[PDB]
Symmetry: C6
Subunit: 36 residues, 6 copies
């Protein structure tokens, strides 16, 4: 595609953002629970 290449890269990067954002959610919930 060539156009296709860029879109595939966005797809991959967005998956990595999803995974990292889930870890932030987990860690922020732990912080909230400790802060009482």
């Amino acid at each position: 595609g060539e156009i296709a290449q860029a879109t595939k890269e966005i797809a991959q990067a967005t998956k990595e953002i999803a995974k990292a954002t889930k870890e932030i959610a987990w860690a922020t919930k732990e912080i909230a629970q400790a802060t009482k």
Copy 2:
């Protein structure tokens, strides 16, 4: 075929980011409420 597949994957990943970001918002609001 290829652009369609990658776009579907972006859609799925962005939905997962939305869900995780909502949990971060909830947890950060709890932290804010505890700090006062």
Copy 3:
């Protein structure tokens, strides 16, 4: 079509991310104000 469907889903998810991110900003500002 398929690209149309996926693009609509990205649009919806990105709107939800916008809303959640604005709440994170509000809550983080309140945390900053409490920390003096």
Copy 4:
């Protein structure tokens, strides 16, 4: 129905995310500076 319509909506939502993310950066810097 349109790809154009959905893409415009993504554009608008991403601008709102940009604005909110800049506020998170400001507020997180203030928190960091207070934590010494």
Copy 5:
């Protein structure tokens, strides 16, 4: 014409999000380092 315009706007907004997200990462690392 319309898809092109919206895509350019997404590109610009995503660059601004990148810059802000890098600052959040820097500030959060400083918080982590202070918390020992």
Copy 6:
């Protein structure tokens, strides 16, 4: 030409967001582990 250019720029920016978000996750996990006082 123009759609291609803008899409490449989105790709690059999203990669930078991915890298920064991973660092936020790491740092937030360290904060969580410290708050385990």
